[PDB]
Amino acid sequence: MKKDIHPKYEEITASCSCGNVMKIRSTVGHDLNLDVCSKCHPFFTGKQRDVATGGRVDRFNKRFNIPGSK
Amino acid sequence: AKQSMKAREVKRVALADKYFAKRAELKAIISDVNASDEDRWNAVLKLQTLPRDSSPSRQRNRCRQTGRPHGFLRKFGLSRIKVREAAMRGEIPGLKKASW
Incomplete structure (x- = not known):
C-alpha cells in the first residue's frame, strides 16, 4: 500500500448495506431452484378427449339445421 | 388413361x-x-x-369421356384437350371465342 497506486476505496467501502431493492443481495438468485422438464406431455395429461379454445355456449345435439332455407 | 384407371x-x-x-x-x-x-x-x-x-x-374427377387424369373442368364435365374439340364444332351451346 504505497500512496500512489490509487484505489477508489472510499467509494468501494461506502454505501455498504445494499437492499434487495437497491442491488438484489446474495439472498436473491437461488430462487428458481432447479431446471425442470416434465415428460408427461398433453394427451398424457389424462386428456383422452380434446376441445378448442372458446365457443362453449349452446352445446346440445342438433343434426345440421344451420342453413336459412336451403 | 388405362381402362383400369377408368374402372377404379x-x-x-x-x-x-x-x-x-x-x-x-x-x-x-x-x-x-x-x-x-x-x-x-x-x-x-x-x-x-x-x-x-x-x-x-x-x-x-378426371373426365367422363377421354379419361384424362388432369386438366379437368367441372363447369362442363370435360377436360382441356377434348373440351375444345366439342367447342370447335359448336356442340357446347353458347360457347365461342372470347374478346374483351
Whole structure:
C-alpha cells in the first residue's frame, strides 16, 4: 500500500448495506431452484378427449339445421 | 388413361355414394363438429377401415369421356384437350371465342 497506486476505496467501502431493492443481495438468485422438464406431455395429461379454445355456449345435439332455407 | 384407371374411378364413386353418404354423419356427430362436449365416443375411429377407398376425398374427377387424369373442368364435365374439340364444332351451346 504505497500512496500512489490509487484505489477508489472510499467509494468501494461506502454505501455498504445494499437492499434487495437497491442491488438484489446474495439472498436473491437461488430462487428458481432447479431446471425442470416434465415428460408427461398433453394427451398424457389424462386428456383422452380434446376441445378448442372458446365457443362453449349452446352445446346440445342438433343434426345440421344451420342453413336459412336451403 | 388405362381402362383400369377408368374402372377404379367407377368403383370409388359407387361406394362413395353407398358408404359415405351414410357414414359422413357418423364422422360428423361423433368425431368432428358435434363431438364438442358430446364426447368423441370411440366407435368411428375403429369403424372406418373398411370404408378406406370410399372417401369422397379419394376421388379426382378426371373426365367422363377421354379419361384424362388432369386438366379437368367441372363447369362442363370435360377436360382441356377434348373440351375444345366439342367447342370447335359448336356442340357446347353458347360457347365461342372470347374478346374483351
